[PDB]
Design a protein around this ligand. Structure first.
Ligand SMILES: NC(=O)C1=CN([C@@H]2O[C@H](COP(=O)(O)OP(=O)(O)OC[C@H]3O[C@@H](n4cnc5c(N)ncnc54)[C@H](O)[C@@H]3O)[C@@H](O)[C@H]2O)C=CC1
Ligand SMILES: NC(=O)C1=CN([C@@H]2O[C@H](COP(=O)(O)OP(=O)(O)OC[C@H]3O[C@@H](n4cnc5c(N)ncnc54)[C@H](O)[C@@H]3O)[C@@H](O)[C@H]2O)C=CC1
Ligand SMILES: NC(=O)C1=CN([C@@H]2O[C@H](COP(=O)(O)OP(=O)(O)OC[C@H]3O[C@@H](n4cnc5c(N)ncnc54)[C@H](O)[C@@H]3O)[C@@H](O)[C@H]2O)C=CC1
Ligand SMILES: NC(=O)C1=CN([C@@H]2O[C@H](COP(=O)(O)OP(=O)(O)OC[C@H]3O[C@@H](n4cnc5c(N)ncnc54)[C@H](O)[C@@H]3O)[C@@H](O)[C@H]2O)C=CC1
Lengths: 265, 263, 261, 262
């Protein structure tokens, strides 16, 4: 084996880490030395390959399918990690969904589902992990919020509500743990090119650009993101590694915004 | 009697006591017709209606549980039948539960989210189409300082109030080119039963039942003015938001908090 | 009339937002001292417009960048009308430039007028307000005090700083009858904005002021309409009223949705 | 072999406190560093040695950052000695505690000049080279006092708020380039700037008891009930200077033990 790395020995759980930002975070944590438990909504043929991709960085990697909207499955994910790898030390609440719709016709079940996954599941997971972190005197809770947790955007009422709520939750957890070795913080990405964003760009391309994905992508990006470029899953992962590292011991209850200038204007 | 909100039809949820009643009173004092609302009927409802009717406008009362979307709709339909379209919607009904995160009851978390955030979405969704048809509306969401900052042992409440503020922004952006605005009022501590219960808990835990000491300590921790905000002041902010001078106030917070968030 | 008998000073109230604020304060019953950088032939008519509401109106020319002239303005008010009870720090200027070529003198001027002059005036008025037990300090900030915009580095810095100042003054007075708050307008159609629109009209739109005005407004303001000087005045009256006794150290943003997105 | 290897950094006010901690962490991450203080001191060579312990090139230049000509001389000295300035850390700053009513006019002006305007001058001087090279980092050391207010610190809160507004504009003007501009907002760090305040409070209110004064000073504002360290602020600077921050633009990294969260 090689030299120890900044997070060597730490056990991380990243919810919704079979795709997009969650996978980028899992990869960056593993590259920084952490053991990692990956998670997706359902078992899929691709899980083995993803596990091996993350495990190529030499740490212990596991996978556990669990619907984060079901508190029993959240508990089963945490208990699986405890049995397979050990106490959960880094919890990354990342699993999330989007639904674009004006408020007047926003479906009730979609509103409830976005609240349940993008906000309440983070509460359940944090609640289940905090007692062990307090007993051990160390912890990291990293909540994947959004720029949409700091500002609003049209046709994203439920998502903006949930993400704003997740930031408020973050502050409270940080304050309740402020004199301990546990920190809680949120990362607020701007647009990152994942399926969650690709589906929106496809809707725009069909609606306004005759299917031209290129024009629709440039228009989608430039409406909101002054950099006129996407944030990458690797950059969000680097922010998670930063928050998890010793230099962030006194970063508490705050947002790390990685958004190409979106919230600055 | 030409008053700034004369004839406007207002619905204030959870307005049988506390801040909601203060808001109803100030809206009526400004000339609005007002529909009061409580979770269930009480013998004192006629007295509360009379209090609000002292300002010379049309007052109605409708019992409805804002956590039940069918009852939110019933409240809106009742208002339409009695007074006409809902022109001012004040989403105020709300609850609190103090607990550390580790032991926060799952049911209480869900209830605080349902009433303090999701009920506002349901009422706004039900009222917006009419406001768009009529070319005018006000949606006024009663958030809190706890929607802008965190406080220990209030995880569900801070989450819901932050979310209500995010919701406010989106509604305002979707209506920005119309005569409809949506904004939030963020009070600091107001001396209502929701706060008095907390002060009582602090008094028993830490001050041997002394309510004066407990009250001053409760206020001083958070509120630089060392005094309570009043229900009348919250009502005055609602009147300001509903007035013509606020036609271009959109998606923002009016914080009435004695300096809480300034530090 | 909620402000009847109160004595107000509005800096930079010979045009635009400041004049709208003075009008609204007078309508609410306040006596008002108007102020501009230097005397102008329209001063008499501006006093007359404000005086139409039956209160006492005065005018005093003073460069707010000169502390001695700020003190002269306060002293003139105290002689003519009485103790300053409502202070509106409004006088302000703009200069649009990329950071690299931003003139040093223009940076200094924007800081001096848009931030430091408010400190000087507040410092001069607070002792009387504390003695009386009541006061209102209303700082005219901007959305540019809460977010950034390209080519406005000095102005954004000064307006952010004015908001920070507002918070400190409010905390130092929080247990008194004195409040300090900031109003943060979005775009309002005043000469300060018209000069910017003219520059972009000449550069990009062939001099078409109407087309340029729309493009300028819609870049930043979701309402796709200007905020008015009357609306900013109404916010000032609200902050000066008894309903705002516990509004302290905060921002009243009147911006058509600019900061909400 | 390190993340900032080969980058040339200038840290204003790096002979003490947070600036020295930032210089040390940047050097540890592989950057060459130019140190700076208000004037020459007997300790300068020892400070150079501290930073040079990490195997990079280190230089020192005394310059009053309130004097635009001396800011330019610092930049040109760096260009001559080490090369183009690639990382600019605007850190030099001062404090003065006073109620608004009696706040001295000259102290207000001095705090604005150093804590806000000097950052503007240094940024203006450095941006053309960064644009020519297609890469840059401007890191402004703000404060929690740039996001909320505190009693008796009107000038400082105004300057720090202004520095954050400035940060946003610079970031927006460079958003489509490889130059980023951001601010770090520390809470209380036990430097001379804070030690002086605590000593004043101890004498005025706690009978000279520095333990009691420190506890009260921290407890009033900082929920962690502990100081942030200069090393942690330095780690935040390294993070902002690293490739993972290529798309962090116009924002604040708050390192404050929970101060702004409540
Ligand atoms: N893509 C973007 O631009 C931004 C995304 N985000 C946030 O980042 C997080 C990840 O999003 P993306 O990577 O973009 O999305 P994605 O769609 O690529 O991935 C979502 C992941 O969550 C999992 N997931 C979904 N529902 C689940 C459930 N009920 N239980 C367990 N897992 C579930 C999926 O299996 C997948 O692994 C989300 O919280 C999203 O809100 C935040 C800001 C910007
Ligand atoms: N009291 C305070 O210090 C502050 C309160 N607030 C907010 O103000 C609002 C009002 O609170 P308070 O007046 O303090 O509380 P309160 O307990 O005095 O009044 C709550 C009102 O809501 C009604 N209510 C409760 N559950 C309901 C339901 N399911 N459906 C309909 N009505 C229901 C009650 O009947 C009562 O009329 C809440 O949203 C609260 O979060 C915000 C900031 C500070
Ligand atoms: N117009 C807009 O869109 C916005 C304006 N503001 C602010 O509102 C305030 C007023 O601006 P506008 O009405 O737009 O501009 P304006 O140019 O119409 O009015 C400026 C006023 O300030 C006075 N003034 C200028 N320099 C002065 C000095 N050195 N001493 C004394 N008085 C002086 C002028 O004579 C004039 O009365 C400014 O602080 C500005 O930053 C804020 C947000 C938006
Ligand atoms: N100590 C604290 O708690 C916090 C400090 N800060 C900020 O951190 C920065 C560094 O402050 P500290 O390390 O705490 O103070 P310090 O007093 O320990 O260090 C000040 C440094 O700035 C230099 N300096 C002062 N005036 C100068 C001038 N005119 N030209 C050039 N250099 C000058 C000094 O020589 C010294 O190197 C300041 O901007 C301060 O506002 C921000 C948040 C918290």
């Amino acid at each position: 084996s090689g030299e120890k790395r900044v997070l060597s020995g730490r056990v991380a759980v990243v919810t919704g880490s079979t795709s997009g930002i969650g996978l980028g975070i899992a990869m960056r944590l593993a590259m920084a030395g952490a053991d990692v438990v990956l998670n997706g909504r359902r078992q899929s043929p691709e899980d083995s390959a993803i596990v091996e991709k993350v495990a190529a960085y030499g740490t212990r990697v596991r996978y556990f399918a669990a619907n984060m909207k079901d508190r029993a499955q959240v508990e089963a994910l945490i208990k699986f990690t405890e049995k397979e790898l050990g106490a959960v030390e880094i919890l990354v609440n990342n699993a999330g969904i989007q639904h674009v719709s004006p408020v007047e016709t926003f479906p009730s079940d979609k509103w409830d589902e976005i609240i349940a996954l993008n906000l309440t599941s983070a509460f359940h997971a944090t609640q289940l992990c905090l007692p062990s972190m307090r007993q051990r005197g160390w912890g990291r809770i990293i909540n994947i919020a959004s720029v949409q947790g700091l500002v609003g955007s049209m046709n994203k009422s439920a998502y903006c509500a949930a993400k704003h709520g997740l930031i408020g939750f973050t502050k409270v957890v940080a304050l309740e743990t402020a004199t301990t070795g546990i920190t809680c913080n949120a990362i607020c990405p701007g647009y990152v090119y994942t399926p969650l964003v690709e589906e929106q760009i496809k809707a725009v391309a069909e609606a306004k650009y005759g299917g031209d994905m290129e024009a629709a992508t440039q228009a989608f990006l430039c409406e909101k993101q002054p950099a006129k470029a996407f944030v990458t899953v690797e950059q969000v992962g680097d922010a998670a590694v930063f928050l998890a590292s010793p230099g962030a011991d006194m970063i508490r209850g705050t947002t790390i915004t990685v958004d190409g200038g979106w919230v600055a204007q």
